[PDB]
Each structure stands twice: as structure tokens, then as C-alpha cells.
Structure of toxic shock syndrome TOXIN-1:
Amino acid sequence: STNDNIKDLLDWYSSGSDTFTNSEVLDNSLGSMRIKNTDGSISLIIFPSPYYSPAFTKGEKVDLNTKRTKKSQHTSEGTYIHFQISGVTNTEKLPTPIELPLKVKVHGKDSPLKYWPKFDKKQLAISTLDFEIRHQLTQIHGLYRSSDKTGGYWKITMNDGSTYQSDLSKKFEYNTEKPPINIDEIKTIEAEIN
């Protein structure tokens, strides 16, 4: 038996993410952006943090690696709208896709990775890194599925000593999210479950 909060975390992190490339900015406002994707759909994305406030202008191209907050809608004027949160970066790519240095320990013992993808983008928002990491944990390591795997943390260490960390017993803190980072500058990523 797990507590209801753990039940919310399982539903959020076990579902997938939304990925769109080379979308165009239609509008940028305080806390939100209207974006037009290549397949013709529109994305309304919210940005709750004062530290991560996208400054792209109308007409610029961006990539989306985000999560939806509710079901998409078909509008009277024939449009299809997605409701999402965070995850907008520039379109810079890496010379070659890299695999990120993730090590996982479940209750002290090392747990091997399975189907951990490579990344070809130069920048990724910290919330995207958060769900990729936690998705690997729920799907391959049993996080949130049983009463014994309901806590821990992940920690990212950069080549310069800067670190980012997140508490597994709580949903990601979007309201305090810092700006996207260059993934090629990540030294290590550690995750522990308790």
C-alpha cells in the first residue's frame, strides 16, 4: 500500500512526454507561450518560474520536450490545441548523440539501466531531465509501485562543480526551475531510491 501522493507521482511519471521539433513562436507572454508545431497543432505552454522565463520572439524556432497537463482540444475554428508545461529550448544539436552518465542504486545496491536513450540536443530543460530520469526509475526500477520504493533523490554534477538535485518523494518544483543546461557539460548523474 502506498500513500495517495505516491499514487499521483506514479500516474504522472509513467505516462509519456510530448516531443516536437522546429516549432515556431506565435506569441510570448508572462508565464506562457503560444507555439505552432510543424504538423499544424498549437501548443499553449506555461512557465511558472521567475528563473526560467523564455525570451524567444515571434517567428523564432524552438524544440519541445514537454508534458501535457490535460487532454488536447479540437476548436471551433478547426485547430488542435495541446496544454503543456515547461520544456522549450533552442534548436542547437550536438555533433553526435550522447548517452548521459546515469547510475542508479536501489536501497544501497546498484541497479543496471535498461533502454536509457541517447540525446542529440545541445540544451535540455531541467524538468525534461527530471522526467527522463524518473521515467527510467518507474518503468525499470519499480519507483512508486510499492511501499518500499517511495523516496530518494537524483543529483546532477556539472564539469564546473555546479549541481542540481531533486527529491523523489515530491513532484518536480516547476515554480523554482532554473534555465536549461548544456547536456555535454554534465559530469555525472546519480539517483538513489529508499
